[PDB]
């Protein structure tokens, strides 16, 4: 339950599978994710 | 030489730590824990 795998869409259409932290707040992840 | 980074921990708690620049991760991941 500590993490969840999800697909993230990026510029012009590339889908990438990522394993994200399930409890940190989303604003903490958007910078390193970019 | 050194670097400072935000190390995330349990339930997502944000923590700040100072690490060496040239030593490899394997020799520092033990004391960091």
B17, A30 in Cβ contact below 8 A? no
Q: How far apart are CA B18 and CA B33, in angstroms?
A: 13
Give the DSSP per-residue string, A1-34. --EEEEEEE-GGG-EEEEEEESSS-GGGTHHHH-
Q: How far apart are CA B32 and CA B16, in angstroms?
A: 11
Q: How far apart are CA A8 and CA A11, in angstroms?
A: 10
Cβ neighbour number for residue B30 with a 10 Å cutoff: 7
Write the CB contacts of A3 (distance below 8 Å, at least 6 apart in sequence).
A19, A20, A21, A22
In chain B, how long is the greatest CA-to-CA distance?
31
Is B7 an interface residue toward A (CB < 8 Å)?
no
Q: How far apart are CA B3 and CA B32, in angstroms?
A: 14
Q: How far apart are CA A27 and CA B10, in angstroms?
A: 17
Is B30 an interface residue toward A (CB < 8 Å)?
no
- The method recorded for this entry reads cryo-EM
């Amino acid at each position: 339950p500590q993490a969840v795998v999800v697909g993230v869409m990026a510029g012009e259409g590339v889908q990438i599978g990522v394993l994200l932290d399930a409890n940190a707040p989303v604003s903490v992840m958007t910078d390193p994710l970019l």
